[PDB]
Amino acid sequence: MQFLNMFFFDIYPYIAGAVFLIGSWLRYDYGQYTWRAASSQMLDRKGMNLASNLFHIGILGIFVGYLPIEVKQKMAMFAGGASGVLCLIGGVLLLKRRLFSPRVRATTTGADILILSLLVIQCALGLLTIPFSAQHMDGSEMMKLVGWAQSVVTFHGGASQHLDGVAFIFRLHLVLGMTLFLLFPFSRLIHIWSVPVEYLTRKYQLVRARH
Amino acid sequence: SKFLDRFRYFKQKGETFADGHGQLLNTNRDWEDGYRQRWQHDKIVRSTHGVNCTGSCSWKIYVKNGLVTWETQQTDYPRTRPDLPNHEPRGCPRGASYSWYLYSANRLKYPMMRKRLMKMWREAKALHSDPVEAWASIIEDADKAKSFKQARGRGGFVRSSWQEVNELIAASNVYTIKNYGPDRVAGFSPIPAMSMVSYASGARYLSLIGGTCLSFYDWYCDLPPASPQTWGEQTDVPESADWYNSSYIIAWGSNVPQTRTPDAHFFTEVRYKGTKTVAVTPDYAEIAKLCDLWLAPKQGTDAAMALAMGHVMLREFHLDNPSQYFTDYVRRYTDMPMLVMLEERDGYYAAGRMLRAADLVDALGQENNPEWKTVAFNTNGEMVAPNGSIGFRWGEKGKWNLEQRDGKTGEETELQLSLLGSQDEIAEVGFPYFGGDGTEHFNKVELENVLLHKLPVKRLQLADGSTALVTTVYDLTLANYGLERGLNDVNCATSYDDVKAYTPAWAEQITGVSRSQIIRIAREFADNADKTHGRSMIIVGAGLNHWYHLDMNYRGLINMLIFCGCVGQSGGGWAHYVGQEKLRPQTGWQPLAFALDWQRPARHMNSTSYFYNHSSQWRYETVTAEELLSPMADKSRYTGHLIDFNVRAERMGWLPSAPQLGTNPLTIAGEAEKAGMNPVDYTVKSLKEGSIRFAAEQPENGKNHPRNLFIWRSNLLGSSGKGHEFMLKYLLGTEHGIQGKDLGQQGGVKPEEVDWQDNGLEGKLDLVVTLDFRLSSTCLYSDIILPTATWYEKDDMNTSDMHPFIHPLSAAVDPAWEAKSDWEIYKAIAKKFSEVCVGHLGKETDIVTLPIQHDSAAELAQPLDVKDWKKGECDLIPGKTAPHIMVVERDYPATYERFTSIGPLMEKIGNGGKGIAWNTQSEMDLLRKLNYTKAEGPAKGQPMLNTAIDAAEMILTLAPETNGQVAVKAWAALSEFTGRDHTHLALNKEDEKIRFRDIQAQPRKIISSPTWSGLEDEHVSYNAGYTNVHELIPWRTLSGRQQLYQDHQWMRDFGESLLVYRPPIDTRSVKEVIGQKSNGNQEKALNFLTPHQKWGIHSTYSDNLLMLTLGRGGPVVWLSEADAKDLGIADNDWIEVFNSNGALTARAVVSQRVPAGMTMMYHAQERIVNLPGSEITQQRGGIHNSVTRITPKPTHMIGGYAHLAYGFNYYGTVGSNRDEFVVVRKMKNIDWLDGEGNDQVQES
Amino acid sequence: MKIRSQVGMVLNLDKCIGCHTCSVTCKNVWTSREGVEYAWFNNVETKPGQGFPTDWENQEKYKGGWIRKINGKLQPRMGNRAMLLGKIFANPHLPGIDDYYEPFDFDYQNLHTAPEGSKSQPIARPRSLITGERMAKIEKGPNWEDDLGGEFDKLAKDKNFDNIQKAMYSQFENTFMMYLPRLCEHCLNPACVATCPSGAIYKREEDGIVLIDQDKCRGWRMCITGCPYKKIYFNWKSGKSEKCIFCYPRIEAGQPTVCSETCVGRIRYLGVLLYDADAIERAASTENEKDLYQRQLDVFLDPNDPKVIEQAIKDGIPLSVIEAAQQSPVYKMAMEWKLALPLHPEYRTLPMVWYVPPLSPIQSAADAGELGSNGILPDVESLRIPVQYLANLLTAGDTKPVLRALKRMLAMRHYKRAETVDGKVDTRALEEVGLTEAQAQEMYRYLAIANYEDRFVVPSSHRELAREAFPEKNGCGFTFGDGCHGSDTKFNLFNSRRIDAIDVTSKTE
């Protein structure tokens, strides 16, 4: 148990992180043509408007989230609760479409099923943690998780110690979430890197000189 | 690093522009190479398309990655004069999609054979070492034979091998030729112009072994019998560039932008030169989009409009205010001044045969062929036999010309046109009128079956002491048109508003075209022609020529052009465009294709009579010859089934036969030797006695039906085959969808020349072999499919009526998979046949019948009437009152050596065609150097014919069109006949010699040739009839001039001596089946038209995904909105169309541009893609020709009579089809019959 | 003032025979890949009709093109930068594949492999190229309305019948149809470029061809909506958008585009047009949409004016391009003769592919008619295609420029007939429309005779300028995968070097 503990929270997070960063750079430099959102909307419009917006607006609200610590827990439980519900609905709807909408299912790749399934699971887990963090309204649970995360990103050994005695569900959520980073550069998730921010301040017409 | 570049974010931001609306960036663009490397290719190869479209467009075949990937038009054709647009780029949508075939899912890769046939073949070979005897064991066993014939079109194709199919083909050919006769083996392939050597491959093999070569021009109904009738010429027209020299054009029943795509620009551009264009189509067709005026006459009634227009012209430009140009023109180039003898009827006279020199006392000083020379009056009142009549063609020289001279004194004379003003009296002559007959679907105008007209006549004293009345064709013509001439004729028009025989008011009722429109355009047209000296033209097509009365539609248009002197002038004339019939280097290609270099003659056959007979469509005939007879004809002198007329035509030497005789023609010689007489005489004696009979008399006795059929460059069983279900039943022996009963079941009158049997012989064909590159409908019903090379995988040549360029087909790569060129396929069949036949056939003697040929001296057969020798009306004189009886020696074992070498007859006899001959020894010597010669064997020393190139080079070196040297000798030969010099037409090109490799580098223009009647010049475009008019070379007609009057007995008795309106015939194919199998939805009768489609060329390209994606995705039928709404049909619904002949299924295209009353299923969408099961036959839906049936016309069987004498594709019955009617209805159950459980049900 | 050049195109609709050859040749070369098999860079439509995609001209439904706000500023109809970004998760106006047609194929192999003893003749049924499933029936295609295929009330939904009492055209005698072939307009103010969040779409400086960078495109599929001509097609398989690329690989050496050289009707004209990029926004934002046409002509520049020549040279335009511009057929038809007109100038994109309206058979009248000002030839008033229809299509509803073009065409005809038939000079019709004999004879040269060298006057894009053609000539094409193509920084993770480059630097300076 202690061995698995150090692996998943001291070692693995760095494997997934190394694969995530160098995988993105390598696929960006050698896979430009493969770097797309892979929209499937045209093949089947039904319900995409609602589904996709629920999922994206939901998951994005959660990430903007990821004033004392216990206040943050309250906000995160109701704000993150709602967003997670919108997100889970969207995700489930997007998965039902991918698996059963003839045109979408026939032109889908495996990674699209896998990555979307793991996200729906990751979202379901996230919601399931709510009742567990509810038993520690003093934000004690949240504190441990934050401690771990900070230790990991600052490259401070012993990160898993911060997780001493935290609800098991938070363990899974962390493992699945890191796994998503590991699988990131090899799935459609790369579209996230490309969020078109510069567009808001760009001149309308673009002209490329002789090069 | 593309990632590191993202840091030069702002460093790549150059100048802004448009006040901050734009930004110029200095960023990488290497990615653009992406599309660059797609465009790049290995090479471009020149090739064209071997499909019947008349396009003849040279393309650039792109090979990339060692594969054919796409194509684009070549633009390097030799440029036309500066004042004419050039031809580039040509091409069309169909052509642009050919590349798709090469590796598509429907490409034929290996030779295939029906499983059942293969199983019995391999089991038979195990018991019969000799393949011939192996085939015998199969074919002579009723159950075995049936087990594979009934499998036709029912799956089971298995992969075979060239060695296996070649042996079976040869074994089968040998067995058939040996036990029944060579003429029991046959092949069908059309339009040799699209792929000369490819056609020649099978025709040459079949000719050597004595098999029959089936025709196509008449079979497809592209042959306008009116042409041979008027000019004694199969078909000769001006090139598309010439349309640009016209200042007034009428597109009549010709969908130019759709069916002449590559040439359309000449039509759209000439409009910018001031040329007015008029479209005449019942529907708002694509061609209307390009014109200034759109006239929409009721389909099938066009002749009426033509007549009324001719009426106005004669009235205004010939009578009221005579045109100097028009008058002189008809005076010198028509038979108008020619004298016609009047026959005595009861109370009135009838127009009889034309007066001949032989009829007069001194025979007008005509010693040679006096009964074959027409007579006219000069302006001084003296009677004269003018130069040019077909009588001067043979038996003398120097007088067969259109010089206005006295045929006796060679002095200059001036023929007079009208007798009015010098007649001895006025006689009433009756003219036939059919404008009052017809079905309920067309308007009629009641008058009299016979219209009496007052004609000026003169009494003459005949050589036999009798007396008779005569009148000119001119006078007869004006009467027929209803022009009042002062004799106060109650049946002539008092004005254009007078409803009389052929007035604008009259045609308004019949056609529905406003009389004032008919007048305006007739006037404008004629006026333009007067101002430009004949630069008015009429583009015409299958829109008019596929009707049963095509001759009336055509002679109506032809008269308009003649009356205005347009034929023979650049910018004017009869522009007939249907199939790609003009194979320019003719006389160079014929000897190759029919082995005329080794044996003479071959076995040509007119296909319409052939199929009408063997697919037994006559057994269901509904049209009687009697109901087509002139009201002034002796009803009792024309009894019998339409097929009876054919049989009589055959035994009289008018039309060819196939099979020819009811006894194996290879055994006649052996019987003649025993009898102690030479084979010919023994045959004539046997025929007289009846010991040997014409096969036509007993087509079902088991020995007079073809047994082996080769099909290539044809989709006969899914495109051209009218009476599809009949072919499936009688020729193939498979299930069929015929809906009606035959003569026997209805207890009708059985023919009087052919045996009858209640149960017709089915599955006559023992072996059907098809060559193709895609699995067509024909392939699907074949026994053996031979994979042939696409047009981008073989060498050949192509020419068209549209332009004067000769260019090639070239292999971009070797045939994919196991495919082989048609040339190599037949070369290998010949090689195998040569060894398999050993011990069965050696140096045989064959008796071959050859009908009297037009352009040969024998054309002067029966001068004044029709004499049937079987009726004892005359003796049986082969070559005059019967067909020639020729002796042909065949060296079967040497078939292959002969096939691959140019025979000795070119050197021993010479070459020629169209009535002229010349020496071609130097050409042969040149060929020995170009093709190399045989080391040894039977053909030792003869030029070789190993490759397609050798063959192509043979054609180019021999033809006058492609060899200036030959061109001068050819014009020299013709100069003998006319007495005028014509060598000046090719002298300035005598050194020109077109080589195959040169045309691969650039298409080349051909040399003016006597084979045609227009010139290949740099100052005047090619215009048909230009030579007749400018070189004074006669038209090969009785009179020598353009014949308006057809005096042959049959033409007169069938009411067509002069043109007349004839309403669509009733096929009686609907009222017998309508309602007999209700599915609950309303059914309605509609006219079934089949103009040619936009998403294919016939059936070719029809399966091409590009064409299917740009079209409606499969077989469809166009219906008017009114008709569709009446029937409850919505756009794209599954509908069923059927009649007595069969049924087809398709989806509807509801449209406003289709007039109520007519439906259009564009020609050839065939039977292999997207077709559900029929609710009427319980079988796969049929095709457009599942609802048609052949109905021959007697006037197209006339032979042994000058211009009306036989010729391969020159004359013969035609496959008309536009008069057909059908029942239409929305389908209910949509069952696919495939076990997929994916069927549908259409509601309400 | 900044001069730039582009090879524009003019299609003479009067000569179009509606054959689709242009569509087939483009398809074979550029879009036969899975993912774009339904896309037709070049497509021809029969009018009246709604087209491909269905009703593409309805900008209220599809939201394509630009709009001019009250403040006078330009904004994509899709919405401003933020509004557009807000629709990124699911483009609410995106056309579905059904709006195009579901690409299909047929099971030809069933004709080959059908088992022995089948109860009925085998046949090849349709199959979806998207799902691979059996299709019970083909219900649509890219050219489904071809030649008035469909009930009038259906085809008349044509956006161009707006403001027209169309009832009369449902009558058989008044029937009419024309053809509208079309590709990407390669606009001067493309809406696509302005509606792509990633800046993947750009207009090339040297020849004005608008391309979608296949590397940079991220598949946000907003551009598709942005294009009011619906000429950008989503490659459903690659996840990126593709569009007509004006055959730049060919144009770059001076060749015609495939659809131009393969046009059977000989209706397409290619010629350089010099324009002032600095005037683009000013012109596309003119208040009245009926002024966009003229505003654009004003943006084009006279190639023979030495003032323009010198400005062009100073601005980098190659000499050969200037030369070509001075003998440009597109310029003669758009600027001098006024025969060519833009397609839907009201979208405010400043389209560079123009059209000559078509003539048509005279309409139905009481009688055979009377000789008009043009004799036996038609007067512009007698043409059957309602001129108002052509105007909605080419001039924002203004019939004046359309009548002028149609009249001049007829005028030319009248003059040429006088010459070639009556052998007389007669400039009455020409003077009536304001053309001189010289202009008429030249119009005739380019329109009627139309020699290959006069239809296409394409100059080189000069790929040697500001680049290094020598090492490219020596090494382009060896696609072994050096992984160094596409970037300016030489550093690369795979420690490699460019095949078509010189890395051993000269030490002798």
Ligand SMILES: Nc1nc2c(c(=O)[nH]1)N[C@@H](/C(S)=C(/S)[C@H](O)COP(=O)(O)OP(=O)(O)OC[C@H]1O[C@@H](n3cnc4c(=O)[nH]c(N)nc43)[C@H](O)[C@@H]1O)C=N2
């Ligand atoms: N794209 C394409 N091109 C091809 C072919 C093809 O299969 N596809 N095939 C070749 C061959 S072999 C032939 S025989 C011709 O194309 C036939 O074309 P054509 O335009 O003469 O006949 P069609 O029978 O189509 O008739 C033309 C139009 O005339 C109208 N029409 C039909 N019936 C009539 C009638 O009775 N009277 C009058 N005045 N018009 C009538 C109709 O609009 C039709 O399209 C030729 N090139």
Ligand code: SF4
């Ligand atoms: S199919 Fe015929 S018309 Fe079409 S491109 Fe080929 S040769 Fe030309």
Ligand code: SF4
């Ligand atoms: S027509 Fe072409 S350049 Fe213009 S907006 Fe559309 S895709 Fe962009």
Ligand code: SF4
């Ligand atoms: S190729 Fe030319 S004539 Fe044919 S449809 Fe295309 S633009 Fe029109």
Ligand code: F3S
């Ligand atoms: S919006 Fe831009 S990201 Fe691609 S799909 Fe269109 S070019």
Ligand SMILES: [Mo+6]
């Ligand atoms: Mo034909």
